[PDB]
Ligand binder design. Sequence first.
Ligand SMILES: *[C@@H]1O[C@H](CO)[C@@H](O[C@@H]2O[C@H](CO)[C@@H](O)[C@H](O)[C@H]2NC(C)=O)[C@H](O)[C@H]1NC(C)=O
Ligand SMILES: *[C@@H]1O[C@H](CO)[C@@H](O[C@@H]2O[C@H](CO)[C@@H](O)[C@H](O)[C@H]2NC(C)=O)[C@H](O)[C@H]1NC(C)=O
Ligand SMILES: *[C@@H]1O[C@H](CO)[C@@H](O[C@@H]2O[C@H](CO)[C@@H](O)[C@H](O)[C@H]2NC(C)=O)[C@H](O)[C@H]1NC(C)=O
Ligand SMILES: *[C@@H]1O[C@H](CO)[C@@H](O[C@@H]2O[C@H](CO)[C@@H](O)[C@H](O)[C@H]2NC(C)=O)[C@H](O)[C@H]1NC(C)=O
Ligand SMILES: *[C@@H]1O[C@H](CO)[C@@H](O)[C@H](O)[C@H]1NC(C)=O
Ligand SMILES: *[C@@H]1O[C@H](CO)[C@@H](O)[C@H](O)[C@H]1NC(C)=O
Ligand SMILES: *[C@@H]1O[C@H](CO)[C@@H](O)[C@H](O)[C@H]1NC(C)=O
Ligand SMILES: *[C@@H]1O[C@H](CO)[C@@H](O)[C@H](O)[C@H]1NC(C)=O
Ligand SMILES: *[C@@H]1O[C@H](CO)[C@@H](O)[C@H](O)[C@H]1NC(C)=O
Ligand SMILES: *[C@@H]1O[C@H](CO)[C@@H](O)[C@H](O)[C@H]1NC(C)=O
Ligand SMILES: *[C@@H]1O[C@H](CO)[C@@H](O)[C@H](O)[C@H]1NC(C)=O
Ligand SMILES: *[C@@H]1O[C@H](CO)[C@@H](O)[C@H](O)[C@H]1NC(C)=O
Ligand SMILES: *[C@@H]1O[C@H](CO)[C@@H](O)[C@H](O)[C@H]1NC(C)=O
Ligand SMILES: *[C@@H]1O[C@H](CO)[C@@H](O)[C@H](O)[C@H]1NC(C)=O
Ligand SMILES: *[C@@H]1O[C@H](CO)[C@@H](O)[C@H](O)[C@H]1NC(C)=O
Ligand SMILES: *[C@@H]1O[C@H](CO)[C@@H](O)[C@H](O)[C@H]1NC(C)=O
Ligand SMILES: *[C@@H]1O[C@H](CO)[C@@H](O)[C@H](O)[C@H]1NC(C)=O
Ligand SMILES: *[C@@H]1O[C@H](CO)[C@@H](O)[C@H](O)[C@H]1NC(C)=O
Ligand SMILES: *[C@@H]1O[C@H](CO)[C@@H](O)[C@H](O)[C@H]1NC(C)=O
Ligand SMILES: *[C@@H]1O[C@H](CO)[C@@H](O)[C@H](O)[C@H]1NC(C)=O
Ligand SMILES: *[C@@H]1O[C@H](CO)[C@@H](O)[C@H](O)[C@H]1NC(C)=O
Ligand SMILES: *[C@@H]1O[C@H](CO)[C@@H](O)[C@H](O)[C@H]1NC(C)=O
Ligand SMILES: *[C@@H]1O[C@H](CO)[C@@H](O)[C@H](O)[C@H]1NC(C)=O
Ligand SMILES: *[C@@H]1O[C@H](CO)[C@@H](O)[C@H](O)[C@H]1NC(C)=O
Ligand SMILES: *[C@@H]1O[C@H](CO)[C@@H](O)[C@H](O)[C@H]1NC(C)=O
Ligand SMILES: *[C@@H]1O[C@H](CO)[C@@H](O)[C@H](O)[C@H]1NC(C)=O
Ligand SMILES: *[C@@H]1O[C@H](CO)[C@@H](O)[C@H](O)[C@H]1NC(C)=O
Ligand SMILES: *[C@@H]1O[C@H](CO)[C@@H](O)[C@H](O)[C@H]1NC(C)=O
Ligand SMILES: *[C@@H]1O[C@H](CO)[C@@H](O)[C@H](O)[C@H]1NC(C)=O
Lengths: 123, 119, 119, 119, 433, 48, 48
Amino acid sequence: EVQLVETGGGLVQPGGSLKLSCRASGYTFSSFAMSWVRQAPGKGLEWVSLINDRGGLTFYVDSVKGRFTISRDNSKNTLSLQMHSLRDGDTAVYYCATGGMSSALQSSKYYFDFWGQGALVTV
Amino acid sequence: GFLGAAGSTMGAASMTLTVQARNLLSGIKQLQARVLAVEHYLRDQQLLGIWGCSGKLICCTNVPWNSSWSNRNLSEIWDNMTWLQWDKEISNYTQIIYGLLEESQNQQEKNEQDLLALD
Amino acid sequence: GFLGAAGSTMGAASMTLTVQARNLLSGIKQLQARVLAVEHYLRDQQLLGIWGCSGKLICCTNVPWNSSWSNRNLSEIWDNMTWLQWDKEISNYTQIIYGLLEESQNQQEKNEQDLLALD
Amino acid sequence: GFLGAAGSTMGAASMTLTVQARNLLSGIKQLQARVLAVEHYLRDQQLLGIWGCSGKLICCTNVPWNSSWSNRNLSEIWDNMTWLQWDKEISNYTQIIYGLLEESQNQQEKNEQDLLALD
Amino acid sequence: NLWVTVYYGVPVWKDAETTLFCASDHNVWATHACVPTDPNPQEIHLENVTEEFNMWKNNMVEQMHEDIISLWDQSLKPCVKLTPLCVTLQCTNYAPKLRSMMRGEIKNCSFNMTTELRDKKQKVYSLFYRLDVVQINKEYRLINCNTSAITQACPKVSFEPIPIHYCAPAGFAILKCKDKKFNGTGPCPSVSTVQCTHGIKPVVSTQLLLNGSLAEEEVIIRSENITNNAKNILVQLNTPVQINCTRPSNNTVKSIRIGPGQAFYYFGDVLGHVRMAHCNISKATWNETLGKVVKQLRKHFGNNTIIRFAQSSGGDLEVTTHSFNCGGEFFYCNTSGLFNSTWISDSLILPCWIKQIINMWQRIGQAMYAPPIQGVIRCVSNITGLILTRDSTTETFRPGGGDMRDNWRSELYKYKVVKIEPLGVAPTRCKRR
Amino acid sequence: IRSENITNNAKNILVQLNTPVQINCTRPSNNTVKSIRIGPGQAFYYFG
Amino acid sequence: NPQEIHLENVTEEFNMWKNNMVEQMHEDIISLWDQSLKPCVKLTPLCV
Ligand SMILES: *[C@@H]1O[C@H](CO)[C@@H](O[C@@H]2O[C@H](CO)[C@@H](O)[C@H](O)[C@H]2NC(C)=O)[C@H](O)[C@H]1NC(C)=O
Ligand SMILES: *[C@@H]1O[C@H](CO)[C@@H](O[C@@H]2O[C@H](CO)[C@@H](O)[C@H](O)[C@H]2NC(C)=O)[C@H](O)[C@H]1NC(C)=O
Ligand SMILES: *[C@@H]1O[C@H](CO)[C@@H](O[C@@H]2O[C@H](CO)[C@@H](O)[C@H](O)[C@H]2NC(C)=O)[C@H](O)[C@H]1NC(C)=O
Ligand SMILES: *[C@@H]1O[C@H](CO)[C@@H](O[C@@H]2O[C@H](CO)[C@@H](O)[C@H](O)[C@H]2NC(C)=O)[C@H](O)[C@H]1NC(C)=O
Ligand SMILES: *[C@@H]1O[C@H](CO)[C@@H](O)[C@H](O)[C@H]1NC(C)=O
Ligand SMILES: *[C@@H]1O[C@H](CO)[C@@H](O)[C@H](O)[C@H]1NC(C)=O
Ligand SMILES: *[C@@H]1O[C@H](CO)[C@@H](O)[C@H](O)[C@H]1NC(C)=O
Ligand SMILES: *[C@@H]1O[C@H](CO)[C@@H](O)[C@H](O)[C@H]1NC(C)=O
Ligand SMILES: *[C@@H]1O[C@H](CO)[C@@H](O)[C@H](O)[C@H]1NC(C)=O
Ligand SMILES: *[C@@H]1O[C@H](CO)[C@@H](O)[C@H](O)[C@H]1NC(C)=O
Ligand SMILES: *[C@@H]1O[C@H](CO)[C@@H](O)[C@H](O)[C@H]1NC(C)=O
Ligand SMILES: *[C@@H]1O[C@H](CO)[C@@H](O)[C@H](O)[C@H]1NC(C)=O
Ligand SMILES: *[C@@H]1O[C@H](CO)[C@@H](O)[C@H](O)[C@H]1NC(C)=O
Ligand SMILES: *[C@@H]1O[C@H](CO)[C@@H](O)[C@H](O)[C@H]1NC(C)=O
Ligand SMILES: *[C@@H]1O[C@H](CO)[C@@H](O)[C@H](O)[C@H]1NC(C)=O
Ligand SMILES: *[C@@H]1O[C@H](CO)[C@@H](O)[C@H](O)[C@H]1NC(C)=O
Ligand SMILES: *[C@@H]1O[C@H](CO)[C@@H](O)[C@H](O)[C@H]1NC(C)=O
Ligand SMILES: *[C@@H]1O[C@H](CO)[C@@H](O)[C@H](O)[C@H]1NC(C)=O
Ligand SMILES: *[C@@H]1O[C@H](CO)[C@@H](O)[C@H](O)[C@H]1NC(C)=O
Ligand SMILES: *[C@@H]1O[C@H](CO)[C@@H](O)[C@H](O)[C@H]1NC(C)=O
Ligand SMILES: *[C@@H]1O[C@H](CO)[C@@H](O)[C@H](O)[C@H]1NC(C)=O
Ligand SMILES: *[C@@H]1O[C@H](CO)[C@@H](O)[C@H](O)[C@H]1NC(C)=O
Ligand SMILES: *[C@@H]1O[C@H](CO)[C@@H](O)[C@H](O)[C@H]1NC(C)=O
Ligand SMILES: *[C@@H]1O[C@H](CO)[C@@H](O)[C@H](O)[C@H]1NC(C)=O
Ligand SMILES: *[C@@H]1O[C@H](CO)[C@@H](O)[C@H](O)[C@H]1NC(C)=O
Ligand SMILES: *[C@@H]1O[C@H](CO)[C@@H](O)[C@H](O)[C@H]1NC(C)=O
Ligand SMILES: *[C@@H]1O[C@H](CO)[C@@H](O)[C@H](O)[C@H]1NC(C)=O
Ligand SMILES: *[C@@H]1O[C@H](CO)[C@@H](O)[C@H](O)[C@H]1NC(C)=O
Ligand SMILES: *[C@@H]1O[C@H](CO)[C@@H](O)[C@H](O)[C@H]1NC(C)=O
């Protein structure tokens, strides 16, 4: 079956940096667009960043455009997220997911079809 | 390679358009053949020009797909069919699409001229 | 139809440019004639290129109208004149307008390059 | 004049591209010469096309400078060297630069298609 | 929710007929309007592509025909036209005191040649072959006198075939079937795109296909309609058969001036013995090759049908015999022993006659005079295919032949020319601003 | 009536009619035709 | 009216013995000579 596993660091301090990495299996990595979302204990679901199937295009929420980078290594089937400053309001369980965008040769998606286990980012 | 993707699916084959574009420009009868090849090239470039595509290889337009030309879904068309089969499938509709593209571009250019006219 | 608007007003005739554009392209002297037609087409396309209009039938520039070339109002020019009469009235100015268009495009290209140079 | 800036510096020469470009178009053997000149012109136009530069004489691209091709500084290249010297300076790298420009334009067009797809 | 997207550079083609270019890396087969071949020609296999080929609707053969006719006419124009040669010939037998079968074939004729000055005549003696001289009714005339003036080919121009590569013009491409046991028509699932074809030797022959290509695996029998007796049957072999052909007699060539700078060359005394030209084919090799052809015939016509071979004895000599260019000389070989077997459920000697006056491509009104060649001629060629035609309990058929287009078709059967259509459309989920 | 200069006598007057005039022309003699060969592949045809 | 422009600070290398204009001059002059004398009388009867 399809699997998606979040990995990365744990405790961070304000003003630092953190790289998260998702390993995908059970499907062709390069055939799906992906995104990063977060769930804070005191919040609901929210979207953070979106990456295309190739990786050429990236999109972010206004609150992180100047700090976060979403990237992907298609040969390693690995999605990466580099974060900076890591403010107290950024503490949450972060997830990566497949779906949410399409190449315009595949049908419309705009949905997050497969969700990983998640990893907790604590400031 | 030239036509190397000819047997590939339409999606995969869309990534080699520059190979064909570069290679298509690679006793009196031989000069006539060269002149006719040039005329065909120029007619195709003029046809792209009138549509407002300029030098783009993949030109997106404002003309909707009618679905009567072909009722296949996007995934079936791009992943399970070749360009030869697709081109044959819609050979009866090509001139209608071309006419719609010319009309759409004429309206677009007039609309742009009127927008530019606003102070 | 081809040149059908030749006797129509300039305004109405501006909507038929597509037909003439398609009709510009459609034994040693037959080959020579085809080559000459190609050369004239390419000269016109290059002239549009230097003006920054290679992809359009109608394009606006930044060159002002002198008003000495013709002091008619837009209503008189577009509604009460044919294109043949207009062409005759500015036959002595066409190359001056062409030179001004080339200079304007050169200034636009240099200014665009400098704007793109800013981070 | 034609090639008048040939001995001038690259910066000054960049302001005379229009006259040199306009003069590129200007029994059987002379007809062959005309056809060959047209073919070379169209080869250059198609090369500009696949790079997305068909509409202008000065076209900036998204390919970075490698610095291995030439390690001269920008001021040296534009204010001291002539275009003939520059052509000699990078004569061994043209086939790489053109390929990179082709790949860059292909990626740019695909990105544009994906951006247009967003509702 | 879909819009039209226009693509340029689509790998789609349509059938088309256009002019092809000559490529080849003096010789009459060397076209002046021809360029060197590519130093590294490309062959790009098309995976998961099937194309319908039809060797009988291939317009590349017509272009090859027109190219050869034009090339030969242009090459023969700047040569001496033998108008004063059609004169009364006082002829006797060159060597009547012989016991070989060549005796009576060579005539020793005397005439006048106009010299160079218009006021003088030069009595000349020369030898001609029997097949080139007809009695006026001793007094004889050249066989061509009642057809057309005959042009002397320039002896400095070689007639040895040079492989010619046909290249597509820009905007077109050549597809190769590249499919083992392809019968000349129908889909080919192994299509490969080539910028230029391989070199095609413009070999001129009848009945037997010489210096051509071989079948990849087995003998291939190609016909527009295998059951139509009126259609030519082209058999491609997978096992070449060597044929040893010779004109064992020696020769010398004399040269005289007939006009203001126009030299005429003619056959002189024969040295040594006078012997007839002939070809040699080993009997076992022919028997096995013919058995393979018969096996293919059994596949098409049945295993228990009686198969009979016969000679095409009726028709012009240029058709009833094998036409072979050996060292530049034109041989007309009987070779009846090759098509004499009947099939049911050390070496062979093939006599040949020599002609100096020929009419190529069955064009009546354009005779050509071949210069003589000094010495003794021996050559070895590869038989790579056969031409057969057919007239039931018994199926009797004959070599037939007599049309050069089929030979070029035999070599060009696997190629097709298509026009590239770079434009196309497709629905996509995008919209222009 | 068409002319370069209708009063210049050095030019022709081209008249385009508004009615056709039918004309029947003939060579009534029943002539023999003969042919001969005059050279290799060359033949001359003549009135008999 | 001729049109020429001096190229300042341009040092081009020339080689008059590798110039292909000489071959074109020769070929064109011989072509003009041969073509211009085609529609003329060939003096066959003088070789007497
Ligand atoms: C074809 O085969 C015959 C044999 O039947 C060859 O004839 C011999 O040729 C050699 C040549 O030096 C002579 O020495 C022999 O005396 C010949 N013998 C006979 C019986 O004829 C003939 O030469 C062969 N021809 C070719 C072209 O290979
Ligand atoms: C063709 O025949 C003629 C005579 O019919 C040959 O001419 C004679 O040849 C003999 C041979 O010794 C000479 O002695 C005579 O003097 C020749 N007569 C003349 C008038 O020349 C002639 O040689 C024969 N041609 C060939 C090639 O054998
Ligand atoms: C078929 O190919 C053979 C091999 O090239 C040709 O035979 C050669 O012809 C040249 C022509 O001058 C000779 O110099 C060689 O000595 C010949 N070699 C042999 C082994 O015969 C032969 O002529 C070709 N046949 C045709 C019809 O073109
Ligand atoms: C032109 O008219 C004359 C008479 O007006 C025709 O001459 C007659 O031809 C017929 C043909 O058989 C003869 O039987 C008459 O005896 C002729 N009569 C006279 C008076 O000539 C002539 O045939 C006409 N020609 C054409 C071409 O119509
Ligand atoms: C051809 O079909 C096979 C079948 O699986 C596929 O693996 C291969 O990639 C295809 N190639 C092209 C060029 O379509
Ligand atoms: C779509 O096809 C139908 C079929 O008749 C036609 O009536 C309709 O006008 C078409 N619409 C467009 C936008 O082409
Ligand atoms: C496309 O249409 C075919 C037709 O049966 C269907 O099987 C397939 O699931 C469709 N795909 C999509 C993505 O709608
Ligand atoms: C196109 O027209 C041909 C007849 O001209 C017909 O056989 C074919 O089915 C048509 N195809 C479509 C898609 O309408
Ligand atoms: C021609 O003139 C008449 C005058 O009444 C006008 O109605 C008509 O529209 C004109 N047509 C064109 C093509 O100028
Ligand atoms: C209009 O043309 C005249 C012609 O000499 C010129 O003097 C004047 O400056 C021009 N005005 C503009 C605004 O171009
Ligand atoms: C245009 O100018 C003409 C005279 O040149 C005048 O009669 C007409 O009313 C003017 N129209 C406008 C709209 O100014
Ligand atoms: C152009 O100049 C010529 C010079 O005689 C003059 O006759 C003509 O009327 C002028 N035309 C215009 C539109 O100025
Ligand atoms: C050649 O060099 C001199 C040196 O100052 C310069 O003034 C001149 O403009 C140069 N030539 C050209 C054509 O620029
Ligand atoms: C410069 O060119 C060399 C050529 O080997 C290449 O390895 C290197 O990555 C290039 N650097 C950049 C920044 O493109
Ligand atoms: C650029 O190169 C020139 C070449 O001589 C040199 O004089 C100049 O100082 C260089 N400038 C820099 C900033 O490297
Ligand atoms: C180009 O390469 C050759 C050797 O392949 C070298 O001698 C020459 O200097 C090089 N030129 C440049 C401008 O790099
Ligand atoms: C050569 O011409 C003469 C007449 O001048 C003729 O008698 C003689 O027979 C001719 N020669 C031959 C071999 O016929
Ligand atoms: C003379 O010509 C006829 C046909 O015109 C031909 O049948 C005959 O064979 C020719 N004579 C000879 C000797 O070939
Ligand atoms: C060639 O093979 C195809 C295979 O379907 C067959 O239909 C055709 O009749 C064959 N033709 C010949 C001449 O063998
Ligand atoms: C092929 O030959 C058979 C044999 O009788 C005949 O019935 C058939 O009509 C022929 N077809 C063609 C197309 O010649
Ligand atoms: C043909 O001649 C060559 C020349 O040596 C010889 O090797 C070969 O065996 C001969 N073949 C036949 C079938 O005579
Ligand atoms: C070879 O000849 C014999 C006759 O002795 C015949 O039986 C045999 O079938 C022939 N070879 C082949 C392959 O048919
Ligand atoms: C000939 O033999 C083959 C088997 O090799 C068989 O399929 C075919 O039907 C046979 N034909 C006859 C007429 O016996
Ligand atoms: C071949 O020789 C035989 C021997 O009798 C003869 O009957 C036949 O007609 C000859 N064939 C040719 C084409 O000369
Ligand atoms: C054909 O073979 C028979 C013996 O099977 C023989 O008597 C006859 O002469 C041969 N004919 C030819 C032309 O080889
Ligand atoms: C053939 O004749 C020539 C004449 O030049 C001679 O040199 C050669 O030795 C002769 N060869 C034979 C085998 O008689
Ligand atoms: C005949 O075919 C063999 C196949 O290897 C080749 O080596 C030989 O050179 C060929 N000879 C001729 C004369 O074509
Ligand atoms: C032709 O008719 C026009 C009608 O106005 C007239 O002005 C002209 O002079 C006439 N020319 C001739 C040569 O009759
Ligand atoms: C026309 O002919 C008359 C006859 O004298 C002459 O006076 C007049 O000048 C001529 N005009 C032209 C334009 O030829």
